[PDB]
Structure 1
Amino acid sequence: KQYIISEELISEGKWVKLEKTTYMDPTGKTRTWESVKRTTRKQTADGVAVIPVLQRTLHYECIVLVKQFRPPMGGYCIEFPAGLIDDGETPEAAALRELEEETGYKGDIAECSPAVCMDPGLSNCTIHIVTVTINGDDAENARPKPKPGDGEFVEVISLPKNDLLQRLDALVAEEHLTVDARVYSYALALKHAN
């Protein structure tokens, strides 16, 4: 019933553009929407985000997260490791690469979502969520080496999967950080499960 008629460019930067989308509402009335798009997509999705499950024997299972300054936010955020998929990269490969660059961990793919939307009222941005396990007892993960690209400055924060939501709340209460909505949603469902 609903569909796009046309798109009018409003403004195009190097990384982000703003468009005015004309669409047909389900009554047959024509309406407009201000929409954001990245300029970098070519790919299954813009990006990947990695759910990294750090597994060490005789330890709690941890979810590995990253803390970074985020200029749109004006502050530090706590997020799953993540980045944009390179032209001709698979989402799995992007996930393992981003995980290694941001955390130093070498992981294995457990599963891969279809393309999921980030904020569909505002943008067309999509990611694959890639669940990855990390064998924390393997030698290659003993002293994990994070490899920043130019202009990346990433702190690693591993938190126990069994108390994830409480630990995140505590970081926000003490550290004045913003938690990512996907991280918080995952944490919630860990608590809400059965």
Structure 2
Amino acid sequence: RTYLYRGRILNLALEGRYEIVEHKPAVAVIALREGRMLFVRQMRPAVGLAPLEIPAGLIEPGEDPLEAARRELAEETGLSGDLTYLFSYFVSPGFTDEKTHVFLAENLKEVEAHPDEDEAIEVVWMRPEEALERHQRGEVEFSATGLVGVLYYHAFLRG
């Protein structure tokens, strides 16, 4: 495996004829409250639009999945909760090793008296049914984390 580029959140390498992109692992948090799921949107230069996602981020040096999940939820929404590990997935094993760990957040609580808002992120509480409905009409795009959250909801959280 020879490297062509070593960067901030990724390295580009070649293994034979295989182009490989090493990428830090990540976390995603599904949070439901009063029939609404906590989605987030932000400027995504790579795609040129802001898809519907759920709180998520890269695991930082020194962090395990659970810890990164707590930090991302706290930093992007100013919330904490009781987290439960659900499952993980490789975003695109055909070229990258980025692995995402998904958690469920319950009993949401303000991290502090007056949470410090994240300017780069837009918090969007929305019924998972609406997110899917709108996506089906081509009105909104999904990130893998957003779609996984929506599907997980329909499969195990309704009622």
Q: TM-score, normalised by structure 1?
A: 0.67
Match of 2:147 among 162, 184, 188: 184
* 2:131 counterpart of 1:131: no
Kindly report which structure 2 residues correspond to 1:47-126, keeping only aligned pairs within 5 A, or say none. 47-54=26-33, 60-109=34-83, 111-113=84-86, 115-126=88-99
Identify unmatched segments of 5+ residues in structure 2.
none
CA RMSD of superposed structures (Å): 2.8
Stretches of 4+ aligned residues off by more than 6 angstroms: 141-144
User: 1:167 is matched with which residue?
Assistant: 131
Shift of 1:98: 0.7
Structure 2 vs 1, CA of residues 128 and 64 (structure 1 numbering), >3 Å: closer, same or farther?
same
Identify unmatched segments of 5+ residues in structure 1.
1-6, 23-31, 55-59
User: 2:11 is matched with which residue?
Assistant: 17
Structure 2 counterpart SS, 1:79: coil
| Alignment coverage as a number of residue pairs | 156
Letter in 2 for 1:33: Y
Structure 2 vs 1, CA of residues 143 and 77 (structure 1 numbering), >3 Å: closer, same or farther?
farther
Counting aligned pairs with the same residue, the percent is 28
Structure 1 counterpart SS, 2:19: strand
Letter in 1 for 2:106: T
What is the distance in 2 between the residues matched to 1:67 and 1:87? 25
User: 1:3 is matched with which residue?
Assistant: none
| Structure with bigger gyration radius | 1
What is the distance in 2 between the residues matched to 1:144 and 1:172? 37
